């Protein structure tokens, strides 16, 4: 339930936020630490090229030694903030092995380690047990070249470079259940609770609750209220067959394709969650992040 | 995963509403099918009496061949015959393991009533024979720590305002941390069958009974930002007064009686080990979307 | 309070929505008739082009009598919710009385009912009937030229052929009230209440009341909960100086224009209102479109 | 929009909280400055009969001076001590032409007490001699038709359970028209002040004072489609039970004396003709958006 090392992680696979001068100096301490203690450090090709590190020749001692990006890593550390570990899982599209965050400035929801005394808290997740939470992800299979997607915060199906009132239809199980009008329909993960379908006026959910959100964006009903679904249906969003004006798909911020008639989106929850590592405990955890992030319930 | 039957149904519990003149017929129709296939039929000690099926001719010999429930396993099926508070009658009869339970909505369709009257003939053949699909539908046990009481609950629980007058302010703690301390009218602690419930009313999130989780929901929170959300279900809630406020606080179960807590009173809540078996009439979604449909209108447009 | 004709009118301008088969018989019924009653009827160039209305040589007869379109003293609409805006963006200046027709879909500023509408029109030109002056919001646009349009439901300043939040600045007499992120905001009349603010989470506002409505859309804050300010008050929306991913204002869901650095949206509320003509009195008919348009709380 | 006094103002009604020790210190401090200035001062009859002003001797070389005021033109100028119900006891105490008021907060900054209690010597000098601004707060005229009895509320009249329990559905006529039949824990009629109050826990839009309107909100409704609606200034609602549902309701006024409603009860709501005039520290518009922020987090981020 904790921590289950089979055998003794030797790989770590490090992501950088990239394109901000402030995580410098943590990736080198950070990599220095992982580095000394005999254990394989792997790097994107990208931030092993970067020119601000190019420059640095002290740092250039362990560079030489930055193994190139399966199974072959074990473990990953993501050095920023809400963003470096959807990067992550965009790269894992498989199993991904456990992660750990850490904020460096911004508290978020998934960086709930702080970067203060980081010896202690690398050397204790390495050797020791850590807690995890296999927070659940969605499996995203777009027909036309059929491709496969895995999305950890949200899938929103909304308007784009044209911008008229979509209608779009939502089979579950083969049944339609509605018809969405508005700006669109946002289908979420348990992470993605306080992610954009939490600015949508949907209730937030603990990451160990099995489900998948429906949520509208401005909904043109002033009945339309957010629902949950259970985790083991096969949602199929499409175009409704009497409107223009396709819609767009965009898979947590990313590369946002336009579904137009005869496409169809089919939405199920993967079988490869992300076990993502808590501090103290999933509870506290996620109750600190909300109060400290989007201010829950202070006064 | 549908019905598993063993020893095949022989015992069947009747539950009506009580207090209205409409269901004396379908009361009637359903007994004399049960009694026809040599089905033992139970009925309340509180039904039986009841004037105007007392004094009714042509159903006395049915009368007689019905034996009295009392307060196990002598039950094995249970017909209701109402809107959505016979099942939560029904569930506040059964503190333990209750039996399959399908309700029967007489004009007021429901959320816990997917079965209609028409044709019931083949629908009872139908459960009893053959398979049917079946939910089970989550409970949470409430404990109230004064002496303890232990109750169980379906719909939801709400710790409010009552015969006191005003602000509510409690404490809630979930596995020993304090979560947060809510003010305004109350608090509602429910069910994701009590997603559409009074719960909904309060501005939350509709759940599907098939999500395990457990919602705590506002009533009018002072703060703009109190959000209702859900937790795992196998998560302990101790609500308790803040050791700052006066005006002790009420709470209500199942909207049934209301106890008074006060300062060193605690409320323990808990997923149910006993969970409510209802039965479908084709399928939890397209059941449960057809009810939100039909009944809250949900996107009626 | 009313209706206060200084003299009996003699022009007719009448909008259509165009684009529609259905409406080309109750146009000619209604064009008929009031040429019927000696009085002058005005028609736009592109609407007296139709193939449709070429074609028909029978109504040629007073095809010649439509006089093409300060002059006009009264505007029958005939479509929902879309030809009244179109007729508000024609007249930027004093608009005559308008009062306009549902053909098939009640809407908000559509009561009047087609059927037997003889009576209608000679009592609305004849007699006394109620009016509503519906607010309009003056937008003025400065760039880097103003622009000067006039507004009936909202202007909304949101995302669009960009990207991102778009984090935006609201100035209200010249203090900064706040800044707002997520998908954008709208400000808008009261009319537009029930337009696409309601939408959004926002309170139906009746027109009687003078007030301008600020509110979000799916806002990152938990807490942003939509506000309205007098009417007589100034508001001036421009991107902070801190992001990138320049806005776009859209009004009247109608032609979008991107705003960057260094421009301004200054709303006040319009000195020259809308007057539009109730069948029963403006209470009535405001809950009946709300009862049966947006299925408000009848259940 | 500003404070023309034409005559001089002569006399000023200082109300406290009271039952509060924090108090006592500012409202001496407060009374010396008005006796200082040859300035009337009024204190009402429970006030001036505390232990903690009886005791100390001290002040009575003022107390003998403080004139006591009696349920009305002698007033001309009033000071609230507290925060967000002196006001409302203020407003309570003058059911015809208010004077104005000035609110200091002693630790909670609210919405109706914006002066802030340090350095109030020039605050105060600049209230009475030079000009301010003010804010015409609505208030709502509200009659009961058992016998009239002839309410103003400043907040919110909120027409809902109590003592009783559950939904007691209630029709809402506007201007003679039934316009809705509301369910749930009630209805709340509230001032565009009022906005920030009660009426803001239940999901409605925060209105700015100068806004002529009267607020309809639900309190949990079992509809999910009945939003919070505005009506113009000049309407007259009309409350009462529909002729179908027991369980009698309960009447709220800003807070205080509930009065149960009953089967031929009436309650009629208008906007009053004697608004509230409540004077800002620099305009309504700031001071309204710095109070937002400040109490209810209404865009901290």
Redesign the interface.
């Known amino acids: 339930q904790r921590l289950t090392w089979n055998k003794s992680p030797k790989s770590v696979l490090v992501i950088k936020k990239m394109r901000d001068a402030s995580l410098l100096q943590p990736f080198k301490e950070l990599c220095t630490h992982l580095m000394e203690e005999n254990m394989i450090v792997y790097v994107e090709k990208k931030v092993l090229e970067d020119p601000a590190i190019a420059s640095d020749e002290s740092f250039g001692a362990v560079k030489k030694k930055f193994c190139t990006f399966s199974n072959q890593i074990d473990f990953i550390i993501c050095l920023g903030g809400d963003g470096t570990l959807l990067y992550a899982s965009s790269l894992f599209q498989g199993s991904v092995p456990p992660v750990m965050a850490f904020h460096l400035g911004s508290l978020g929801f998934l960086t709930p380690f702080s970067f203060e005394n980081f010896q202690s808290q690398v050397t204790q997740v390495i050797e020791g047990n850590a807690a995890v939470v296999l927070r659940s992800r969605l499996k995203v299979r777009v027909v036309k070249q059929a491709m496969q997607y895995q999305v950890l915060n949200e899938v929103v199906i909304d308007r784009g ?1 044209s ?1 008229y009132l979509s209608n779009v239809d939502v089979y ?2 083969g ?1 339609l ?7 669109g329909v946002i289908v979420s993960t348990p992470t993605g609770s306080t992610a ?1 379908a ?9 990451p ?4 998948i ?1 429906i949520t509208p ?15 083991g ?1 096969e949602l199929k969003i499409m175009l409704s067959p009497e409107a223009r004006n396709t819609a767009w798909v965009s898979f947590d911020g990313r590369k946002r394709q336009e579904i137009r008639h005869g496409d169809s989106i089919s939405i199920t929850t993967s079988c490869y969650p992300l076990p993502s590592i808590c501090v103290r ?1 999933p ?2 955890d996620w ?1 600190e992040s ?1 109060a400290q992030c ?6």
Do not use: E, K
């Not at 939490?198 to 603990?206: D, L, V, Y």
């Not at 160990?208 to 489900?211: L, R």
């Open positions: 470079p911008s579950l199980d049944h259940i509605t018809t969405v009008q508005g700006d954009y939490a600015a949508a006026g949907a209730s937030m959910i603990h160990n609750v099995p489900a959100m964006i401005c909904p043109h009903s002033l009945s339309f209220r957010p629902i949950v679904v259970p985790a249906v405990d509870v506290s109750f909300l989007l201010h829950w319930n202070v006064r």
